[PDB]
Design a protein around this ligand. Structure first.
Ligand code: ZZ7
Ligand code: ZN
Ligand code: ZN
Length: 241
């Protein structure tokens, strides 16, 4: 059993598949978890989502690596056996975009914030093949997110990074904060090296206001939590100003 140094542990309702862990969150939503083995430190878990939308599947975030991301695709093939229409990746760091080449090799259409695509080559990442753009209030421009089904993409403002985006799952009470949101018991906001410490608090609160009726908040490095993940993250971020 993988026991990560950073990230949630395995509990009841988790399926180990190869090097990854999968957890069903709703009838049509699963969390994927992959692990970066840091020598002398141990495993760092990172989470994304898999959403079934009728006869097709949608993915939020890659795993840390191409091979792990190919394992996500293998899990989808075994457990769902429907084609992946597209993936949305939530900023230009390894935990979220490290596996782009596996998605591209599989022929899956990839989407990211235009700014993530512009930053990708500066972050040792491969850009997504399509760029999302956003309104002044953070909502994605719908012409840039064709046929996204239940994925409702929201740019909350700079926080964990300047490019971080978030995703609500319409038809459910789930919203995904990626690395912007930390859980209600977290002591740290994680890596602030690329963060906007001035705007972080407002960006965390904007995510909450964008999906005001989401009761299950999914994030990169903890198990799904209540809305207290949002409010606690914002309270920690208030201390940065
Ligand atoms: C879990 C992290 C502290 S590391 C991860 C990310 N870092 C990477 O993906 C790096 N490539 C990395 C380098 C060394 C060890 C682990 C990750 C970041 O900088 O936001 N997201 C951070 C976070 O979400 O706070
Ligand atoms: Zn990051
Ligand atoms: Zn992260």
């Amino acid at each position: 059993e993988i026991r990560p140094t950073i990230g949630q542990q395995m509990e009841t309702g988790d399926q180990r598949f190869g090097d990854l862990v999968f957890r069903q969150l709703a009838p049509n939503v699963w969390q994927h978890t992959s692990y970066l083995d840091m020598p002398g430190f141990g495993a760092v878990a990172s989470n994304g989502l898999i959403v079934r939308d009728g006869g097709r599947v949608l993915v939020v975030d890659t795993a840390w690596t191409d091979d792990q991301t190919a394992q996500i695709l293998n899990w989808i093939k075994q457990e769902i056996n429907l084609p992946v229409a597209l993936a949305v990746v939530t900023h230009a760091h390894q935990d979220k975009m490290g596996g782009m080449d596996a998605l591209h090799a599989a022929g899956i259409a990839t989407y990211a914030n235009a700014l993530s695509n512009q930053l990708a080559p500066q972050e040792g990442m491969v850009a997504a093949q399509h760029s999302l753009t956003f309104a002044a209030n953070g909502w994605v421009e719908p012409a840039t997110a064709p046929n996204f089904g239940p994925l409702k993409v929201f740019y909350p403002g700079p926080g964990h990074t300047s490019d971080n985006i978030t995703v609500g799952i319409d038809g459910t009470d789930i919203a995904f904060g990626g690395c912007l949101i930390k859980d209600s018991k977290a002591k740290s906001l994680g890596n602030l090296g690329d963060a906007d410490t001035e705007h972080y608090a407002a960006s965390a609160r904007a995510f909450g206001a964008a999906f005001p009726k989401a009761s299950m908040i999914v994030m990169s490095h903890s198990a799904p939590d209540s809305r207290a993940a949002i409010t606690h993250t914002a309270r920690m971020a208030d201390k940065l100003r």
